[PDB]
Amino acid sequence: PGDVAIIGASCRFPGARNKEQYWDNLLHGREGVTFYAKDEIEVDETLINSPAYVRATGALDGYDEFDPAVFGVSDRMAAAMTPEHRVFLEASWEVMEDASYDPERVRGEVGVYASTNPQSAALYSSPPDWVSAGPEVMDRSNAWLPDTITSNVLYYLGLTGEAVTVTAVCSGFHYAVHLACQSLLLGQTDMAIAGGVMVRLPQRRGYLWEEGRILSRDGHCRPFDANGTGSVLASGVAVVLLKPLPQAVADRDHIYATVKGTAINNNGISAMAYGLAQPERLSACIAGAMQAGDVAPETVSMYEANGFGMPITDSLEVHAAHLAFGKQSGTCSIGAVKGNIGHAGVVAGGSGAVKAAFALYHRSLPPTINLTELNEEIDFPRTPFVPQLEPAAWQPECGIRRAGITALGGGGYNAHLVLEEPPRPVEREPENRRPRIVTLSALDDAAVSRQRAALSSWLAEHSDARLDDIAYSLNLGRKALPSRWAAVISTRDELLEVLSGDGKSGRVSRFGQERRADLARFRRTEDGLALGSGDEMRDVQALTELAAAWVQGERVNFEVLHADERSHRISLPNYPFARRRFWRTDW
Amino acid sequence: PGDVAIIGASCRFPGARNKEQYWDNLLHGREGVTFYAKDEIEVDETLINSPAYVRATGALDGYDEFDPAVFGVSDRMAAAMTPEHRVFLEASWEVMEDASYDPERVRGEVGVYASTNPQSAALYSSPPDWVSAGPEVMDRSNAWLPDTITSNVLYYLGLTGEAVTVTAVCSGFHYAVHLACQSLLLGQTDMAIAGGVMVRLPQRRGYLWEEGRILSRDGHCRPFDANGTGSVLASGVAVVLLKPLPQAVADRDHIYATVKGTAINNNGISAMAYGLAQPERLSACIAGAMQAGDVAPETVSMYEANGFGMPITDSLEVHAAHLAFGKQSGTCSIGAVKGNIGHAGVVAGGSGAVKAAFALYHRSLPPTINLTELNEEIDFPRTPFVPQLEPAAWQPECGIRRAGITALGGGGYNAHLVLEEPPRPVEREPENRRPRIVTLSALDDAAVSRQRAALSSWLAEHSDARLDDIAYSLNLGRKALPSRWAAVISTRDELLEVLSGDGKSGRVSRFGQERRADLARFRRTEDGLALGSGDEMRDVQALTELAAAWVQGERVNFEVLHADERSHRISLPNYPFARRRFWRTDW
Ligand SMILES: [K+]
Ligand SMILES: [K+]
C-alpha cells in the first residue's frame, strides 16, 4: 500500500568510494577517519600548533573530481559548479544505473528531492551578481545556487518531473526522503530521487576540541561508551531511488528495502543545546514514524541511533527511543554508524539509513565500533536495546525484519524513518539457453575498457547472477553513449572471455571490421532497428548483425529483444568516471 | 474537505509597508519603483556612468530595521542575523497577530514552511566556521543558515511543530504554500505559517540593461505591452497563516480566501531561456492545480500572471494558460502585479497570490498598470483573458469567484495555485450589551500608547466591527506582554473615550492608581485567575478588579470569560515595532 521501495542506491563516505565498499567496511568494523601530520594540513595556520587541535577528519576522496563530458557540461561550467553540485549530479547518474533505469526511456514523472549545505557554496566562490540578465549570468546562477542542485539533475539526466531542494541542517537526508514519499503517496510522481550531499570546505582539515562539546578529544567517536568525548566531522553523499512497492514488484525491480513510515518535527520552544535530544519531542517523532507505517514497536529489532558519542547525548536519545517503544517491545539491536565515519552533516542521517537498508538486504547486523566500556548510566539491561558489539546474522524472534533510523541536527530538527526488509524473491523459471546481446557504452574508448574491467570483476564476485538478467539490465537500463561495445554470447564464461583483454576477440568485433552494417536486413520501428522474426532474435548470426549495427551508431529496439522473457533488473557496476579535478581560480 | 483557509496575512513590498497599504496601492494603480540620482547610489562605481545603467529598483523600506526586544533577541544576535532572517521573523509575528492567535496559547502543532534566497546570506557576511562547536558558534550558525529561517520562528514565537525551508528561485512562495498544504491535508500539523522573503543586497542599486533580456530599458515594467522591455528587481516579504477550511469555519476564524489546489513541476530537459514559459510543462502545472482543487476552468475569472513585461515571455505564458483553460472556458480577467512593483524574486509569486487573495476578499479587481499598447501577437480576443485596464467590481456570470496565480523561475521551476473566495458570512446573533474587558500589551509604555492610537484610528476605519469581536480578539489573540493596559467598557463609544488622550480616564486605570488588586477574590485555574461565579463575570466591579490584577502582571484565564458567547476573530492592528537599524561591522 503506502510502502515505498528503494530500488537503487548510491553513496560515498569516509573510506568508501561506493556502497559495496561502504558495506564491506561496516561488516569488518573498520574506521574511515583519517589522521594527518602537521605538514599535510595546509590551512588553519593559526590553529595547527594548538594543543587542542585534532588532525582528524572523515575525508571524501575525489571531492573535486568530475567528468563533465558525460553530462554535456563544459570545462568552464564544471569549475563554476560547487563540489556539492558535481558530487550530487554524479550520484544521481549512479542511482539510475544501479536501479537499471535508462533516463532516456523512463516514461513517467521523476521527482528529485535533495538536501544541501548552503555554507559550502558560500565558501567555494562568490555568489552570482544579478546586475544584468545575460545567459552567462544564468549559467553562473545554476552553478552556485542551492536551488539548482535538484534542477541540474532533471536537466542533465534528461528527466521530466519536479525538483525540490530543502535545507534542514543535519537532518537533510531524512527531510528529503520524507518529502519524496509524500510526493509518491499523493501520486504526483512515479519515482523519486532522494538524498543529500555534504562537502566540507576546507576539506583537508582538523578541528578544535573544546571541553564539554560535541567534537572528540582524540579523533575517535565512541558511541554509547562511558569515555566517549564526541564525534568527528565528515563529508559524503547518499542518494536513493524510490518507487511505490506494489509497482516495484510488478515491474520486477531490484529492491534493497522498503520505507514503511517517516516523521519530522522540531524541538521548537522546548529547545536544547546542540546534539541533545529532547525526550518528549524526539519520541513523538519516533512514535509518529511507526504509526505512519502501521508498525508496532514489538516488530522493530534494529535501531540506528544518532549517537554522537557523548554520554549525556546518548542517554537522552536512548531514553527518547525507550519512551516511544514502551515496555512490551522486547529486545532490539542498537548501534551508531558515526563510530565508523564521524558526523556527516547533511547526510549523517543517510549514512545510518543506508546502513540499515543493507542490513535488511543482507539479513546481517554490522557491529558498532570503538566500544570498550558500556555507559552504565544508560541502564541497558532495563531497556529494549542491546549494543551490537559483534557482527551477527539477523534472525529476529519477531518474524519480520524492521529497522528505525533517527537523525538529529541543530535548530531543533528531528526526523525518524522506519524500514522493512524487501519481499522474498519469487521462484524463478529456469534460464533459457540462447544467444544474448550484451552492450557497454561510454564517451571514449578508455572508459569502455574500464567498464569491461569493472564487469569482469563483478562477474567473479556475483557468481549467482543470471545471464538473462545481466543482458536485460545492460540493454534496457543504460544510456546509449557515443563510444560503444557489444558482444553475442550464450554463457557466463564466454561473456567473461569477450570482456577480457582488449575486448576485440568477440564475434561482433570481427563483423564490424569486415563490413559496414546493411540496414536492409532490419525492419525500422519507432524505437529503432529490429530483426525480422522471433527465430532471428535467437540466431547467433542475426544477433551479431544487429549488435554490430548498434556499435556503428544505429538505433536498436532492445524492448522487442526481451519481450518474450520476464527478466529482472539487477545491480551492476556504475559508470567509471574519469577523475579530472576542477576548481575555481578566480574568486 | 481538502480546502485550506488563509486566516492571517502579512506582507511588505515596494511602496507598501503593510498589506492595507499594499492593497490600497493596487486599487489606485500606483507604481512603487524608485528612481535615484547618480550620487544616491554608493555602489557599482564601475557601472554608474555606463549608458546602459538604469537607476531603478524596487526598494524594501526598513530592510535593515528590527526590534529584538520583542523577540528576546540580543543586539549582537540581531546584527548577526541576515536581513532575511529578521524580516521574515517580524512578518511571522505579524501574521499570527493578524489571525488573532497567541502562540503562547496555541494548543496544536504549527508548521513553518518558508523560502529564502541564499545569495542574500552569502553577501551579508561570511558563513559560520565549524572548526569548533561552542555555543557562540551555534548562535552564529542559527543567524546565517537558510535552514533556520523557519526554525527561528518556532523558537522565538514559542510554537511547537515542524520547520521546513525550501529554495526554489523565483517560485519560492508557491513551493512553501504547496508543501504547507501537504502537511495540513496529511494531518501532520493543525495550522501552518507559509511564506517567503527576498532582500536584495546591495539594496540601493540599479541594474544593467542588455538587449533582449529580462531587465527593462527605462526602469518601467509594462506587462502585456507591445513596447515592453522587461521588469525591475524588487525586494519584499509575504507570509500567510493556513488552516483546514472546516476547522477554520468551526473555530469562527477570519478567512481571507481558501486554497483549493496547488501544483509544482520543472521544465527539466524541455528547458527554455530565463523567463520563457515552456507551453506543455507550464500548462500541465496549471491544469494539475485546478484538478487538485476540483475546480473547472470555466469557473476561474481571474488569472494573475507572472508577466515580466517582455513580449515573448508574455506570449508564451498566455499561450500556456490557454492550453490549461481550454476553448470552452469563457472569459477571465488577466493581470500582472509586476508592473506595479517589479520582480520580487523568491516572493514574486507571493505578491501575486496576496493580490488575488485580497481581490477575492473585497470582491474587486485591481488594474494592471503601464499598459498603453496591447501586444498584438498574443491576440487577446482569441483567448479567454481580458487585460484588466480599469478597477472594477468582481461580479462573475459563473456565480463563484476563483483565481489562479502562476510563478515562473530560473532552473525550470513552475508553480500554480488556485484560490476561492471565502465562505459567505453567517448570520450573527444580536450583540449583548454587557461590560467587557479589553486588553493591550507591549514591552514599554510608549509602544502601548502607539497601540491605543492605532486602535482608535482603526475604529474610525471599520465602523461595522462588533465590540464583542474586538474584545474576544484582543483578549484571546494577542500575547500578554510586560507593559499592560486594560479597560472595562460596554459600547464602542466607551472604548473610543478610554483610548483617547493618555488612556488613564478609564475605570481600570483609576483603580490601579488607588489600590492593588485583592487576589483572594479570584479562583486559580490551570489557565490563570478566574471569577468565582457566573454572576460575577457580568458585574462591572468584579470585571474591573480582574483587569487591574492583569495590569499588575497576573495571568488571567480569558477563555472562561468568553465561554458563553460564540464570537469571531477579526483583523486588528499589528504590534508597533520600534525599528532600530542593525548591520554587521566585521565581515
Ligand atoms: K579544499
Ligand atoms: K509530525
Which residues, including other chains, have CB under 8 Å from residue A461's CB and lie 6 or more apart?
Answer: none
Contact (Cβ atoms closer than 8 angstroms) between residue B132 and residue A213: yes
Among B123, B134, B179, beta carbon nearest to A210:
B134
Q: Min CA distance, B135 vs chain A (Å)?
A: 8
Q: Which residues contact A359 (CB under 8 A, 6 or more apart)?
A: A302, A365, A366, A394, A403
Cα A204 to ligand 1 centroid, rounded to whole Å = 6
Give the CA count within 13 Å in the CB-facing half-sphere of A184. 31
Q: How far is CA B133 from CA A315, B128, B141, B585, in A?
A: 20, 11, 10, 23
Dihedral pair phi/psi, residue A290, rounded to 5°: -70, -35
> Which residues have C-beta within 8 Å of that of residue B122, sequence separation ≥ 6?
A118, A121, A122, A126, A127
* DSSP type of residue B125: S
Closest CA to B63 of B154, B170, B197, B171: B197
Taking CA–CA distances from B345, the nearest residue in chain A reads A130
Asked if A221 and A342 count as a contact pair (C-beta separation under 8 A), the reply is yes
Q: How far apart are CA B68 and CA B83, in angstroms?
A: 13
- With CB atoms and an 8 Å threshold, state whether B215 touches A132: yes
Q: What residue in B sits closest to A156 (Cα-Cα)?
A: B269
Distance separating alpha carbons of residues B199 and B41, to the nearest angstrom: 17
C-alpha cell at A509: 568485433
Among positive and negative, which fits the CA dihedral B302, B308, B309, B312? negative
Ligand 2 centroid vs A106 CA: distance in angstroms?
Answer: 33
CA A257 to centroid of ligand 2, rounded, Å: 23
Q: Is A122 near chain B, with CB under 8 Å?
A: yes
* Assigned C-alpha cell, B169: 528561485
> Within a 10 A sphere around the Cβ of B2, how many other Cβ atoms?
15
Chain B: give the shortest CA distance to residue A208, in Å.
5
CA B436 vs CA A86, B471, B532, B561: distances in Å: 64, 7, 17, 9
A178-181 long-range Cβ contacts below 8 angstroms, 24+ apart: A178/A262, A178/A263, A178/A264, A178/A415, A178/A417, A179/A113, A179/B164, A179/B179, A180/A4, A180/A111, A180/A113, A180/A242, A181/A4, A181/A242, A181/A259, A181/A262
Q: How far apart are the first and last CA of chain B?
A: 51
- Number of neighbours of residue A58 by Cβ within 10 angstroms: 28
Interface test with B, best of A41, A47, A53, A162 (most B CBs within 10 A): A162
Phi-psi region at A317: left, alpha or beta (left = phi > 0; alpha = psi -120 to 50): alpha
Q: Does A344 touch chain B (CB under 8 A)?
A: no
The neighbouring-strand residues paired with A405 are A304, A417
Determine whether the interchain pair A44/B122 forms a contact, defined as Cβ–Cβ distance below 8 Å.
no
Angle at B206 between CA B200 and CA B208, to 5 degrees: 110
The size of chain B, in residues, is 587
CA distances from B140 to A205, A473, B127, B145, B164 (A): 21, 49, 8, 9, 20
CB A418 within 8 A of CB A357: no
Cα of A201 vs centre of ligand 1, distance in Å, is 6
CA distance B539 to B536: 5
What's the grid cell of residue A168? 534542514
Helix, strand, or coil here: B151? helix
3-class state of residue B306 by DSSP: coil
In which element (H, E) is residue B161 found? strand B161-166
For cell 502585456, name the residue.
B224
Residues B352, B354, B355, B356, Cα dihedral to 10°: 90
Interface residue B50 vs chain A (CB under 8 A): no
What is the rounded CA–CA span in Å between residue A349 and residue A236?
A: 11
Task: Measure the CA–CA gap between A406 and A415, rounded to whole angstroms.
Answer: 6
- Chain B 5-44, residues with CB within 8 Å of chain A CB atoms: 44
Q: Determine contact, residues B346/B115, Cβ cutoff 8 Å.
A: yes
Judge whether A292 and A262 are in contact, CB under 8 Å.
yes
The three cell numbers of residue A510 are: 570481427
Cβ within 8 Å, pair B154-A266 = yes
Across the interface, whether the CB atoms of A210 and B175 are under 8 A apart is answered no
AA identity, residue A494: E
Identify whether the C-beta of residue A162 lies closer than 8 Å to the C-beta of residue B265. Answer: yes
Element (H, E) at A248: helix A245-250
Ligand with an atom nearest the CA of residue B192 = 2
Residue B122 contacts A, CB cutoff 8 Å: yes
Q: How far is the CA of A265 from the centre of ligand 2 (A)?
A: 5
- A364 reaches B (C-beta below 8 A): no
Strands B302-304 and B332-335: parallel
d(C-alpha B325, C-alpha B332), whole Å = 10
The length of chain A in residues reads: 587
Listing DSSP states for B183-225 in one string gives HHHTTS-SEEEEEEEE--SSSS--EE--TTSSB-SSS---TTB
With CB atoms and an 8 Å threshold, state whether B266 touches A166.
no
What gap in Å lies between CA A165 and CA A163, rounded to an integer? Answer: 7
Interface A-B, measured as beta-carbon pairs within 8 A, has a size of: 214
CA distances from residue B9 to A98, B5, B15, B97, B453 in whole angstroms, order as listed: 47, 11, 18, 9, 22
A69 class by beta-carbon count within 10 Å (0-12 exposed, 13-18 middle, 19+ buried): middle
d(CA A439, CA A254): 20
Contact A54, A216 (CB under 8 A): yes
Nearest to A274 among B118, B138, B269 (CB): B138
Binary contact (A121, B122; C-beta < 8 A) = yes
Write the DSSP symbol of residue A233.
B
Angle at A208 between CA A204 and CA A212, to 5 degrees: 140
**Cell numbers 571490421: residue:** A513
Out of A127, A164, A411, whose CB is closest to B119?
A127
A392: enclosing H helix or E strand = strand A392-393
Query: What is the spatial distance between Cα B570 and Cα B587, in angstroms, rounded to a whole number?
Result: 44
In which region does residue B435 sit, left (phi positive, over 0), alpha (psi from -120 to 50) or beta (all else)?
A: beta
The answer to whether the CB of B449 falls within 8 A of the CB of B503 is yes
Spatial neighbors of A321 by CB under 8 A, at least 6 apart, are: A282, A283, A286, A303, A305, A385, A404, A406
CB contact under 8 A, B411 and A44: no
Helix (H, G, I), strand (E, B) or coil at B7: strand
Q: Is A50 on the interface with B (CB under 8 A)?
A: no
How would you label B182-204 residue by residue, b for 16+ Cβ within 10 Å and e otherwise?
Answer: bbbbeebbbbbbbbbbbbbbeee
Q: How far is A15 from chain B (nearest CA, A)?
A: 21
Rg of chain A taking only CA atoms, in angstroms: 25
A194 has which bridge partners?
A113, A240
Q: Where are the alpha helices (DSSP H) in B518-584?
A: 540-551
Q: Do residues B455 and B440 touch, judged by C-beta distance below 8 A?
A: yes
Contact at 8 Å (CB) between A348 and A304?
A: no
What residue in B sits closest to A183 (Cα-Cα)? B182
Task: Give dist(CA A205, CA A63) in Å, integer.
Answer: 14
Q: A68: helix, coil or strand?
A: helix
From chain B, pick out residues whose CB is under 8 angstroms from the CB of A207. Answer: 130-132
Cis peptide before B202 (omega within 30 of 0): yes
To the nearest whole angstrom, how far is the Cα of B183 from the nearest Cα of chain A?
Answer: 9
User: Using CB atoms within 10 A of its CB, is residue A433 exposed (0-12), middle (13-18) or buried (19+)?
Assistant: exposed
Residue A533, SS3 per DSSP? coil
A154 touches chain B (CB under 8 A): yes
Say if A338 is an interface residue toward chain B (CB within 8 Å).
no
Q: Which residues pair with A11 in a beta bridge?
A: A238
* Contact state of B127 with A132 under an 8 Å Cβ cutoff: no
Cβ of residue A187 closer than 8 Å to a chain B Cβ: no
B496 C-alpha vs ligand 1 centroid, how far in Å? 66
**Is residue B40 exposed (0-12), middle (13-18) or buried (19+ Cβ within 10 Å)?**
exposed
Q: Nearest ligand to the C-alpha of residue B188?
A: 2
A 446-485 residues with CB below 8 A of B?
Answer: none
Cell, residue B76: 549582537
On the CB side of A539, CA atoms within 13 Å amount to 10
Q: Which residues pair with B197 in a beta bridge?
A: B237
Phi then psi for residue B581, to 5 deg, are -90, 135
**Residue with cell string 545603467:** B53
Query: What is the spatial distance between Cα B533 and Cα A114, in angstroms, rounded to a whole number?
Result: 58
Ligand 2 centroid–CA A2 distance in Å is: 17
Gap between the Cα atoms of A183 and A181, Å rounded: 5
Question: How far separated are the first and last CA of chain A, in Å rounded?
Answer: 51
- Residue B95's nearest CA partner among B19, B8, B185 is B8
- Solving technique for this entry? X-ray
Neighbours of ion ligand 2 (CB under 5 A): A 265; B 188
| Domain residue extents for chain A | 1-468+563-587, 469-562
User: Could you tell me the three cell numbers for A331?
Assistant: 529486545
Residue entry with cell 513553518 = B112
CB atoms within 10 A of CB A497: 15
Q: How far is the CA of B550 from the centre of ligand 1 (A)?
A: 59
| Residues of chain B neighbouring A159 (CB-CB closer than 8 A) | 268-269
Say yes or no: A539 contacts chain B, CB-CB below 8 A.
Answer: no
Q: Using a CB-CB distance cutoff of 8 angstroms, which residues of chain B are in contact with residue A206? A: 131
Distance between CA atoms of A145 and B536, rounded to whole angstroms?
62
Q: How far is Cα A379 from Cα A400, in angstroms, rounded to an integer?
A: 27
Residues of chain B numbered 159-178 and touching chain A (CB < 8 Å): 159-169, 175
Distance CA A542, CA A538 (A): 8
CB atoms A169 and B145 under 8 Å: yes
CA of A530 to the centre of ligand 2 (A): 53
**Neighbouring residues of B155: CB distance < 8 A, sequence distance ≥ 6:** A268, A269, A271, A412
Contacts of B122-125 spanning 24+ positions with Cβ under 8 A:
B122/A118, B122/A121, B122/A122, B122/A126, B122/A127, B123/A127, B123/B201, B123/B202, B124/B82, B124/B83, B124/B201, B124/B584, B125/B80, B125/B82, B125/B584, B125/B587
Identify the CA nearest to B148 among candidates A479, A27, A478, A167.
A167
CA atoms within 13 A on the CB side of B216: 30
- Mark yes or no for CB contact A47/B210 under 8 Å: no
Nearest to A12 by CA among A241, A338, A341, A236: A236
Looking at residue A448, what DSSP letter applies?
Answer: H
For residue A282, which ligand has an atom nearest its CA?
2
Show the beta-strand stretches assigned E in A445-577: 483-489, 523-525, 528-530
CA of A286 to the centre of ligand 2 (A): 10
- What Cα–Cα distance (Å) separates residue B102 from each residue in B306, B543, B558? 35, 22, 12
Is residue B258 within 8 Å of residue B5, measured between CB atoms?
yes
